[PDB]
Design an enzyme around this catalytic site. Structure first.
Site, short mmCIF file in Angstrom:
data_model
loop_
_atom_site.label_atom_id
_atom_site.label_comp_id
_atom_site.label_asym_id
_atom_site.label_seq_id
_atom_site.Cartn_x
_atom_site.Cartn_y
_atom_site.Cartn_z
N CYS A 129 0.77 -1.22 0.00
CA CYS A 129 0.00 0.00 0.00
C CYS A 129 0.82 1.28 0.00
N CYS A 160 10.00 -2.13 7.17
CA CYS A 160 9.28 -1.00 7.77
C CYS A 160 9.08 -1.23 9.27
N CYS A 192 17.42 5.24 13.82
CA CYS A 192 18.38 6.31 13.66
C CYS A 192 18.63 7.10 14.94
N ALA A 222 34.38 2.93 7.07
CA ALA A 222 34.61 3.90 6.02
C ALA A 222 35.95 3.81 5.30
N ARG A 270 46.19 4.83 16.83
CA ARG A 270 44.98 5.31 17.51
C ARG A 270 45.13 5.60 18.98
N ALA A 329 40.27 -4.43 10.32
CA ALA A 329 39.10 -5.20 10.77
C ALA A 329 38.25 -5.63 9.59
C1 FAD Z 1 31.76 3.48 12.64
C2 FAD Z 1 32.80 2.42 12.28
C3 FAD Z 1 33.65 2.52 11.20
C4 FAD Z 1 34.68 1.53 10.95
N1 FAD Z 1 35.49 1.62 9.86
C5 FAD Z 1 36.29 0.63 9.59
C6 FAD Z 1 37.10 0.65 8.33
O1 FAD Z 1 36.98 1.46 7.51
N2 FAD Z 1 38.08 -0.34 8.34
C7 FAD Z 1 38.20 -1.31 9.32
O2 FAD Z 1 39.10 -2.09 9.25
N3 FAD Z 1 37.35 -1.43 10.41
C8 FAD Z 1 36.50 -0.48 10.48
N4 FAD Z 1 35.77 -0.48 11.63
C9 FAD Z 1 35.68 -1.74 12.47
C10 FAD Z 1 34.91 -2.70 11.59
O3 FAD Z 1 33.63 -2.20 11.09
C11 FAD Z 1 34.27 -3.79 12.53
O4 FAD Z 1 35.19 -4.35 13.44
C12 FAD Z 1 33.07 -4.65 12.13
O5 FAD Z 1 33.04 -4.68 10.66
C13 FAD Z 1 33.35 -6.09 12.67
O6 FAD Z 1 32.57 -6.88 11.79
P1 FAD Z 1 31.92 -8.23 12.38
O7 FAD Z 1 31.23 -8.96 11.32
O8 FAD Z 1 32.85 -8.96 13.24
O9 FAD Z 1 30.81 -7.63 13.38
P2 FAD Z 1 29.61 -6.57 13.16
O10 FAD Z 1 29.66 -6.05 11.77
O11 FAD Z 1 29.48 -5.71 14.34
O12 FAD Z 1 28.37 -7.55 12.99
C14 FAD Z 1 28.06 -8.48 14.03
C15 FAD Z 1 26.57 -8.70 14.15
O13 FAD Z 1 26.21 -9.71 15.11
C16 FAD Z 1 24.93 -9.39 15.57
N5 FAD Z 1 24.75 -10.12 16.83
C17 FAD Z 1 25.48 -9.85 17.96
N6 FAD Z 1 25.21 -10.68 18.96
C18 FAD Z 1 24.23 -11.52 18.42
C19 FAD Z 1 23.53 -12.58 18.98
N7 FAD Z 1 23.60 -13.14 20.22
N8 FAD Z 1 22.60 -13.19 18.20
C20 FAD Z 1 22.39 -12.79 16.94
N9 FAD Z 1 23.01 -11.75 16.31
C21 FAD Z 1 23.92 -11.17 17.12
C22 FAD Z 1 25.15 -7.87 15.91
O14 FAD Z 1 23.84 -7.34 16.14
C23 FAD Z 1 25.79 -7.45 14.57
O15 FAD Z 1 24.78 -7.18 13.62
C24 FAD Z 1 34.78 0.44 11.81
C25 FAD Z 1 33.88 0.25 12.89
C26 FAD Z 1 32.89 1.27 13.11
C27 FAD Z 1 32.01 1.06 14.33
C1 HEM Z 2 2.82 -2.63 9.31
C2 HEM Z 2 2.42 -2.23 8.07
C3 HEM Z 2 2.33 -0.74 7.71
C4 HEM Z 2 3.07 0.31 8.08
C5 HEM Z 2 4.37 0.39 8.88
C6 HEM Z 2 2.36 1.51 7.65
C7 HEM Z 2 2.71 2.81 7.88
C8 HEM Z 2 1.81 3.85 8.06
C9 HEM Z 2 1.98 5.08 8.77
C10 HEM Z 2 3.19 5.46 9.67
C11 HEM Z 2 0.87 5.81 8.58
C12 HEM Z 2 0.47 7.21 9.16
C13 HEM Z 2 -0.30 7.10 10.48
C14 HEM Z 2 -0.78 8.37 11.12
O1 HEM Z 2 -0.73 9.41 10.44
O2 HEM Z 2 -1.20 8.28 12.30
C15 HEM Z 2 0.00 5.07 7.71
C16 HEM Z 2 -1.24 5.49 7.26
C17 HEM Z 2 -1.94 4.86 6.26
N1 HEM Z 2 -1.76 3.57 5.87
FE1 HEM Z 2 -0.28 2.32 6.46
N2 HEM Z 2 1.21 1.10 7.01
C18 HEM Z 2 1.16 -0.26 7.01
C19 HEM Z 2 0.20 -1.03 6.37
C20 HEM Z 2 -0.80 -0.52 5.56
C21 HEM Z 2 -1.68 -1.26 4.68
C22 HEM Z 2 -1.65 -2.79 4.55
C23 HEM Z 2 -2.50 -0.38 4.10
C24 HEM Z 2 -3.74 -0.60 3.17
C25 HEM Z 2 -4.45 -1.71 3.12
C26 HEM Z 2 -2.14 0.93 4.55
C27 HEM Z 2 -2.75 2.11 4.18
C28 HEM Z 2 -2.65 3.31 4.85
C29 HEM Z 2 -3.44 4.51 4.62
C30 HEM Z 2 -4.56 4.58 3.54
C31 HEM Z 2 -3.04 5.42 5.48
C32 HEM Z 2 -3.51 6.90 5.64
C33 HEM Z 2 -2.68 7.89 4.78
C34 HEM Z 2 -2.63 7.54 3.32
O3 HEM Z 2 -3.71 7.59 2.67
O4 HEM Z 2 -1.54 7.19 2.79
N3 HEM Z 2 -1.09 0.82 5.45
N4 HEM Z 2 0.59 3.86 7.40
O1 FUM Z 3 37.44 4.69 8.95
C1 FUM Z 3 37.92 4.73 10.06
O2 FUM Z 3 38.46 5.76 10.65
C2 FUM Z 3 37.92 3.49 10.88
C3 FUM Z 3 38.79 2.55 10.39
C4 FUM Z 3 38.93 1.38 11.27
O3 FUM Z 3 38.36 1.29 12.34
O4 FUM Z 3 39.72 0.45 10.77
#
Ligand code: FAD
Ligand code: HEM
Ligand code: FUM
Ligand code: HEM
Ligand code: HEM
Ligand code: HEM
Ligand code: NA
Length: 568
Positions: free
Chosen positions: A39, A68, A82, A169, A402, A549
């Site tokens: 939708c 979503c 976020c 990065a 570092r 890493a």
């Molecule tokens: C902001 C940032 C930038 C970086 N930049 C770089 C770079 O440019 N170069 C570099 O060398 N390194 C970089 N590093 C480090 C590098 O990203 C990492 O060490 C990361 O990639 C390690 O990867 P990984 O797969 O081991 O773990 P992650 O990528 O952290 O993934 C592990 C996953 O396991 C999931 N998980 C954890 N516990 C469980 C559980 N019990 N059950 C199920 N799922 C679980 C976590 O939720 C996560 O999604 C950066 C790190 C960060 C934070």
């Molecule tokens: C978990 C599933 C869905 C998500 C996360 C989602 C997301 C949202 C959000 C955040 C809003 C606004 C709520 C507000 O203003 O209070 C909304 C409104 C709306 N949703 Fe959903 N939705 C979902 C499923 C659906 C489905 C299945 C339909 C239709 C069958 C639908 C149709 C609409 C409509 C018609 C509105 C009102 C605004 C518009 O016309 O777009 N949604 N939805």
């Molecule tokens: O991009 C960075 O600064 C991080 C790199 C790293 O952790 O290896």
């Protein structure tokens, strides 16, 4: 309406979102999210209605197909993901403030009664290998094992894939690649080995570092064969030559590598389960793995029968309480990590009999944006930026390790410093446009002006940049001995990014051998149990080099998948 389902049910039936029997399709809520999309359109179509000049909840840097329900729950208020790193002006309907409150594995002992029922039941699935974690190491191991002929299930506790790896990065280190040769760089696996050992203060397990350096080109080749672009090769701290690979232009290596891995897993129809946490490795009567008990957020506890379990759960750098116990100097620091990087994977490894090593070694990244609270890549410095204090002066070799960079920044006035660069540096690394878009890189056409904006002595900064450009021109930094001086800061406008250190990466973790087999304290292999990526210890010794890493998780993730498939 008090919630999103109540709002929709004013005009819609329950089956507008639900399956015919009403049961949740799975813990990823696959069917249910398909109905939201039917939708509202895809994430990209929704994003057209929620544009802000510089941010958008529905079009971010996260790779993969973000569900979503990752942010919109139906029957209860929910949190914007976020918000775990940013504080954007959002108005999501039925929102609640970001709060991460995840029980520890030890706390989950409270569900003993429900866990026993799960374990007494038939296994929900019977496969060859279970990979735990959808970061670079876990996808790599899932793909590898599948390509070797094993049937895998890959689980992820978070609502979104990629862990901390999607945030990476600066790059992925590798030596002697075809990519380096095309950029006229000369390197070798031996020199990468040497840099790594010295960078980790010789604490690193040499057998593990040999795997890291010797498989490094192969890992770059593998990723590239899968659709990755690793053709831009830059410099990071502590490397003798440029060897940090990343997409053309200097885009972030991380989100790209994880998107390529996800796309490859989807092409192979790998069973990937979101909101599914690994809780406990199950072993038979002879102590070899027989499966794993998982906890589905929406489906409850269940177990998977398998010959092997690969733990690829990441580090514990978001867990400041565990970090402060090991290194009291990092207590209270902001982290660069995703919210679930708390070390529960380590607790799973230990309960299974795995021993840990090097846990006291915790890396702070020297440059978190003060204003944005997020990591600013070390590639900004590798590509030519300098660091100045509030007195408008250089105070450290910006491409040192570092540990030393963080201490030097914290020793400055206000406990922070500024990255300073120009448009030549900016144009050389597209990732820099992302800091400008976030609003954390103020700019001006003169250093005097920039200084006045940011509280930096403008006339000393002007002098500092002229002096540094003279050292670049002569080729030797006699002030701080920075060994690589790639660019003069003299093109277009100038930029400043206020930076301070944050907790980033945990060098310690589960002990593994060179086949990525988890070992106990007596150095005995636990048959069937593997570890790969930042959850392991021994690869990086006392200090990890930037870029090592991403190299580690691909190499060890791939290796664990192949070894697990063979083991079977
Ligand atoms: C902001 C940032 C930038 C970086 N930049 C770089 C770079 O440019 N170069 C570099 O060398 N390194 C970089 N590093 C480090 C590098 O990203 C990492 O060490 C990361 O990639 C390690 O990867 P990984 O797969 O081991 O773990 P992650 O990528 O952290 O993934 C592990 C996953 O396991 C999931 N998980 C954890 N516990 C469980 C559980 N019990 N059950 C199920 N799922 C679980 C976590 O939720 C996560 O999604 C950066 C790190 C960060 C934070
Ligand atoms: C978990 C599933 C869905 C998500 C996360 C989602 C997301 C949202 C959000 C955040 C809003 C606004 C709520 C507000 O203003 O209070 C909304 C409104 C709306 N949703 Fe959903 N939705 C979902 C499923 C659906 C489905 C299945 C339909 C239709 C069958 C639908 C149709 C609409 C409509 C018609 C509105 C009102 C605004 C518009 O016309 O777009 N949604 N939805
Ligand atoms: O991009 C960075 O600064 C991080 C790199 C790293 O952790 O290896
Ligand atoms: C009165 C109408 C509905 C009924 C009776 C109903 C029933 C349920 C039940 C019983 C659950 C929990 C299932 C479990 O734990 O196994 C659930 C969860 C869920 N339902 Fe509904 N549902 C209705 C309408 C909707 C609508 C309109 C949406 C989307 C807009 C929706 C989306 C979801 C989602 C995404 C979940 C997972 C958890 C959550 O997000 O709250 N449902 N539903
Ligand atoms: C296709 C997937 C999704 C659907 C269909 C959906 C649906 C919607 C809708 C209909 C709205 C209200 C827009 C309006 O004002 O008309 C909305 C707002 C919002 N959604 Fe989603 N959403 C999805 C995924 C997500 C995800 C994954 C996140 C977080 C990462 C998220 C966070 C938000 C936020 C923060 C708002 C308020 C936006 C603002 O204040 O700019 N949504 N969503
Ligand atoms: C769907 C959720 C998110 C949205 C919409 C979002 C939005 C943004 C925006 C608008 C920027 C500025 C550059 C750009 O336009 O991409 C940015 C940068 C950044 N964000 Fe997010 N963010 C999200 C979640 C997160 C999370 C949860 C983290 C940390 C775990 C994070 C880490 C970062 C970092 C490190 C940067 C710096 C630039 C880069 O490395 O690409 N973001 N984000
Ligand atoms: Na580690």
């Amino acid at each position: 309406a008090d919630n999103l389902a109540e709002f929709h049910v004013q005009n819609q039936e329950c089956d507008s979102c639900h399956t015919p029997d009403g049961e949740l399709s799975n813990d990823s809520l696959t069917y249910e999210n398909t109905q939201c999309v039917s939708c509202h359109g895809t994430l990209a179509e929704v994003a057209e209605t929620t544009k802000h000049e510089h941010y958008n909840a529905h079009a971010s840097h996260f790779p993969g197909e973000v569900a979503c329900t990752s942010c919109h729950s139906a029957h209860e208020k929910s949190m914007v993901y976020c918000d775990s790193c940013h504080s954007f002006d959002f108005n999501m309907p039925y929102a609640k403030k970001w709060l991460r409150d995840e029980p520890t594995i030890a706390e989950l002992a409270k569900d003993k009664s429900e866990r026993q029922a799960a374990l007494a039941s038939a296994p929900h699935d019977t496969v060859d290998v279970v990979v735990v974690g959808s970061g670079g190491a876990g996808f790599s191991a899932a793909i590898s094992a599948t390509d070797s002929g094993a049937k895998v299930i890959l689980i992820e506790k978070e609502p979104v894939i990629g862990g901390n790896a999607k945030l990476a990065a600066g790059g992925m280190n590798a030596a002697w690649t075809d990519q380096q040769k095309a950029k006229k760089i000369t390197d070798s696996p031996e020199l990468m080995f040497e840099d790594t050992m010295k960078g980790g203060q010789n604490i690193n397990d040499p057998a593990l570092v040999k795997v890291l350096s010797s498989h490094s080109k192969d890992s770059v080749d593998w990723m590239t064969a899968m659709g990755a672009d690793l053709t831009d090769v830059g410099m990071m701290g502590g490397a003798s030559v440029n060897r940090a690979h990343r997409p053309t232009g200097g885009a972030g290596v991380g989100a790209h590598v994880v998107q390529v891995l996800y796309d490859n897993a989807v092409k192979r129809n790998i069973d990937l389960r979101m909101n599914t946490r690994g809780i406990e490795v199950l072993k038979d009567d002879k102590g070899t793995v027989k499966g794993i008990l998982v906890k589905g957020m929406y489906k409850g506890y269940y177990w998977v029968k398998a010959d092997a379990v690969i733990l690829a759960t990441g580090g514990f750098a978001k867990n400041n309480e565990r970090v402060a116990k090991l290194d009291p100097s990092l207590k209270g620091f902001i982290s660069t990590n995703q919210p679930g990087a708390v070390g529960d994977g380590l607790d799973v490894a230990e309960n299974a009999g795995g021993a840990l090593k090097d846990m006291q070694y915790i890396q702070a990244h020297p440059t978190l944006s003060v204003k944005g609270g997020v990591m600013v890549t070390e590639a900004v410095r590798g590509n030519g930026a300098i660091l100045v204090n509030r007195e408008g002066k250089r105070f450290v070799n910006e491409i040192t390790t570092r540990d030393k960079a963080s201490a030097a920044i914290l020793a400055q006035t206000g406990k922070s410093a500024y990255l300073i660069f120009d448009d030549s540096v900016r144009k050389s690394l597209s990732k820099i446009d992302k800091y400008i878009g976030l609003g954390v890189a103020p700019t001006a056409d003169s250093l005097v002006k920039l200084g006045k904006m940011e509280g930096i002595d403008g006339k000393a900064l002007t002098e500092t940049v002229a002096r540094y450009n003279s050292l670049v021109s002569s080729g030797k930094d006699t002030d701080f001995e920075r060994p690589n001086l790639p660019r003069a800061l003299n093109e277009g406008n100038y930029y400043a990014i206020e930076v301070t250190p944050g907790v980033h990466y945990t060098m310690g973790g589960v002990m593994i051998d060179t086949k990525a087999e988890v070992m106990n304290a007596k150095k005995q292999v636990i048959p069937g149990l593997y570890g790969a990526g930042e959850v392991t210890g021994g690869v990086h010794g006392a200090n990890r080099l930037g870029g090592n890493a991403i190299s580690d998780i691909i190499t060890f993730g791939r290796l664990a998948g192949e070894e697990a498939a063979k083991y079977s």
